[PDB]
Amino acid sequence: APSQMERSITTIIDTFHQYSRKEGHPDTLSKKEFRQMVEAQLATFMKKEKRNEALINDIMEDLDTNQDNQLSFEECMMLMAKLIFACHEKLHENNPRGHGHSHGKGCG
């Protein structure tokens, strides 16, 4: 049976395809598809981005490294990598040591 780790990897890919298949090339994200994905799937991790079209505009341009106005899977995974690392760092910030009790924030 698929492990928690394998399920998580598959779900990341499935989520990308849920938005990439809507219009244009079915394996790339148009601006509209990327914004939809960010607002629906990263509304907590990218809370300031969902309500701010401005930062989404910067991020699309940063990720679109071949300047073809769509995000390939490989281009979009640069964002996933940044999010994973940021979440790891924030998880540690929210779980300080030495309090003799647990914390439950996770990452934000």
Q: Is position 62 annotated in a ligand binding site?
A: no
Q: Which of 24, 39, 42, 84 binds Ca ion (CB under 5 A)?
A: 24
Which residues is 29 bridged to in the sheet?
71
Residue 99 touches which member of Ca ion, its own copies, Zn ion, none, C-beta under 5-8 Å by kind: Zn ion
Residue 54 touches which member of Ca ion, its own copies, Zn ion, none, C-beta under 5-8 Å by kind: none
Instruction: Write out the DSSP string of 33-72.
Output: HHHHHHHHHSTTTTHHHHT-HHHHHHHHHHH-TT-SSSB-
**Site for Ca ion contains 84 (CB under 5 A):** no
Phi-psi region for residue 67, left (φ > 0), alpha (ψ -120 to 50) or beta?
A: left
* Residue among 27 and 62 whose Cβ is closer to Zn ion: 27
What is the binding site for Ca ion (CB under 5 A)?
20, 24, 64, 66, 68
